[PDB]
Amino acid sequence: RPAILPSGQILSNIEVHSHRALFDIFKRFRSDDNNLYGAEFDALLGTY
Amino acid sequence: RAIQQLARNVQAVLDSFERGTADQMLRVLMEKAPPLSLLAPFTLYEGRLA
């Protein structure tokens, strides 16, 4: 569930996966996961 | 005298929130850093630890 326009361009060309546990949640794939290209949301239709 | 003491007291209480963040900065930076002894050789096997 990525953002569209970023805020800060990270510059350090560094390996990521080797530092797995450095942060909470992260998922990796190769390409065309077909989940990322899926629109989905939960709307409320009326207030009364 | 009462008001001058109150001023001289708020001057020291309000002050402490500068040294306070100066101390919290060290307190948080100290826990991130792994010892360099335990880090220098680790970054020479990267990508290979499969």
DSSP of B1-50: -HHHHHHHHHHHHHHHHHHHHHHHHHHHHHHHPPPGGGTTTGGGSTT---
Measure Cα distances from A18 to A15, B18, B19, B26 in Å: 6, 38, 37, 27
Chain centroid, CA A20 distance in Å? 16
Contacts of B46 in chain A (CB under 8 A): 15, 18
Q: Cα separation of B40 and A21, whole Å?
A: 19
First to last CA, chain B: 73
Residues 6+ apart with CB under 8 A from A20: A26
d(CA B37, CA B30): 15
List the one residue out of A15, A34, A39, A35 whose CA is nearest residue B42: A15
Q: B46 and chain A: CB distance < 8 Å anywhere?
A: yes
Chain A: residue nearest B32 by CA? A22
> How far is the alpha carbon of A45 from chain B, nearest alpha carbon, in Å?
45
Chain A interface residues (partner B, CB cutoff 8 A)? 15, 18
Sign of the dihedral through C-alpha B42, B44, B47, B50 = negative
SS3 A21: helix
Nearest residue in chain A measured CA to CA from B47: A18
Technique employed here was: cryo-EM
Residue given tokens 């880090």 in the structure block: B39
* Total Cβ atoms within 10 A of residue B3: 7
Task: Provide the residue type at B1 as one letter.
Answer: R
